[PDB]
Subunit: 224 residues, 4 copies
Amino acid sequence: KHGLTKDMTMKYRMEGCVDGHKFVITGHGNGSPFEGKQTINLCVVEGGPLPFSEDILSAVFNRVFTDYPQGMVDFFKNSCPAGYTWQRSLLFEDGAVCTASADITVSVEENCFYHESKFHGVNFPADGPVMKKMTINWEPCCEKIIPVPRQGILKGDVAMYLLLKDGGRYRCQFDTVYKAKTDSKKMPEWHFIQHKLTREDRSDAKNQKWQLAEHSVASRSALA
Amino acid sequence: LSKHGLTKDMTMKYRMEGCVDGHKFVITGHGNGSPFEGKQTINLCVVEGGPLPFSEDILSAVFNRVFTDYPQGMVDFFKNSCPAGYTWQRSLLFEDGAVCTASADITVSVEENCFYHESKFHGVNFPADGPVMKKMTINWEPCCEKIIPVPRQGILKGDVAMYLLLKDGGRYRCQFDTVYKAKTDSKKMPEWHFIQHKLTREDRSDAKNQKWQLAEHSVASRSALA
Amino acid sequence: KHGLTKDMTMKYRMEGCVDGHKFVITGHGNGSPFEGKQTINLCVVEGGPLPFSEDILSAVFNRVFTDYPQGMVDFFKNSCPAGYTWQRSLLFEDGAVCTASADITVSVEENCFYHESKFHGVNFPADGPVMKKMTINWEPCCEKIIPVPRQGILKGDVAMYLLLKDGGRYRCQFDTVYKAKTDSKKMPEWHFIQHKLTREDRSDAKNQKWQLAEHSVASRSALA
Amino acid sequence: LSKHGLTKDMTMKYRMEGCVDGHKFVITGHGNGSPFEGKQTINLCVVEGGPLPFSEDILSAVFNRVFTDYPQGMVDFFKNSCPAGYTWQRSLLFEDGAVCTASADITVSVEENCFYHESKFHGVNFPADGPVMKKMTINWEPCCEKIIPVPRQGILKGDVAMYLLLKDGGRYRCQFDTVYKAKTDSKKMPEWHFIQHKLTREDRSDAKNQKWQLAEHSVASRSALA
């Protein structure tokens, strides 16, 4: 129901700019919304190769792909098929700052998600891990999701870590606001979503490209 | 297995010396709990400087990760450090610019089956019109703290964005960053993990003293994703 | 010299997005680079009226307009006529985050500045002063300017305040990186720039528009 | 005009109690300066807990805005509070996540022509490999602090992004946020303004004690733009 089926496809377009370097990424995906599982295949269409680590972009590419237990309000599935939008700041530990946003829609006819995104990054230091391309993946995490009932929005809060080639970690604070396109009659209570997001490089002579895989699962506090 | 010097049911004694915006105070107390269950109850009294002009909830998380239920198969850094115990240091950055520093030293007296917990707390710049100075805070919301090993140094770091829930139904955010150190060298270090916590306060003050009870339940876990 | 004259003109284009609301601003200006004085006339061409305070945008519209004392290296005038670029994060006290960047060029032939800018803002609270349009002006300030000699860039650091209708103030941290297009042989030592920037609303039935005026003056520490 | 209880040339005495990552210490000292010139020299000795395992520069700005040259025509909040004096509270957020809180109480003994300065300092989470624990800091760079009145409450707030300059020619940032309170009610409040500061340290330690001299020159100003 909700324009959703067990197995679905996705189409992506991101327009971005990081320290003045413009780029465009397009892509396609498949996954299973009720399992909170997705696979995403991206290609740098303009501005490639990227002079910064592509890992900074990965979490911009849809909380409809979350496994919500029975009994928990699913704000994101409830927003479908019209969809939902989000806005996020990324505050990195070395003073780099990004802003990101996206618009998610379901084409029922087509059993497809259309995802349009924007990304703006400033002040990545020249010899930092993003510009030296020393990143490998984000570490799995636990995001806290908070309702703001008076406004019909959710906020998310997670302290993320990007794992580095030498074994270190590079921290980034994510702060997100999530809004349905049509204000739903039901709001969840606060909860967690755990996430694991991985990148596999698929780049060839012609184009820079890669595959992301995500698994996300919502839960309540484990303490009675 | 006995080597930690711990038992199923134990007691604790507390002393805290603090200062929040120039107001000096001393808190003492006693507790009981079950360290392998990650459960404790703590009874505190303001023995100098009472009544406090700021919300006592800013203090609550100062009062012992030996009281965490660690699943088998995870390395328990804290109980591994017993009975000598461990120390920690924490920054608290509140959303309205207030800042606190806190530190503590935990030791086990095996003969008394009792923890000795000594702490220090300094806070600055709580706005006169905010929830701490207006005593509008009711409880910390239950949370999920990330714990990260620093194998180079044999310490752990913890990171958690905490929220105090307010009388009016609002929420007030505070970022905790903590460094956890054993008093002697862990042969073993954990992988990164989570600790979920739930910490509650019930006021027990009367005409003689400002007093309150805390209760904590804390449980460690790994990522739920394969 | 440097493609500069005492009296010059400017042309502006900004493409922006703040909490998903797209907009385009164009404009024209006149001022005097050596006096650090400029007047800027802006019009919201797409996306108007703006649903957020326009004051958040004002400091995106050129450090060529700084009065540098004799004896102090002028990184910005030295970059002319090719120009300079900059990237900035704006961290507001209520969790709102913006990223901004711009590209400045001098048309010598035309005695004109071409200024192209981008602005992305997320997470302005609905009942905050930006969305309630409770702002009047930025308070004059003192920015610290620091050289990074190994890289040929400058960083700037200023804690800004937006004055509110009720008499309050709303703080925003500015962190900027400034880069010449052609790496200059000379770098300044650290210094201050003081700035005063004002807005006058010029809006009519057809379009939202306003005028900015800036005066900026560089100095060294006043302590021997 | 005499009402402040100050004179052209005055002395000071200091005591600081502190703790940085569990290392306790006490510093005492003496000073001389000229409060209307905004100039002072301060001589400090580590009397308990020495030698310090962290850079003493993290402490320097703990040691009195009565020592500011205010131009005529500006309201001098600090000298207006004399001779009773004033108090302050400050957060120090360093760029590598270390956090300090500091507070002090300044009083004038008019009979001794001497300031009594009592302070407290708590710091946490300096990385073992950073410049503070490696003693790589040489001096704070001269700065420009914004001072803002809060007329509702009769306090001032100050805001300054400070940088410690390192042996290697690098720089290490620290955000200072301070609240300044007079001990009794200012009939008068300043408009917002700037204070430019220059604070220097020269080590004077020997085989017996860790000791150093600070010197400060601080001058208030208004915006330079019409």
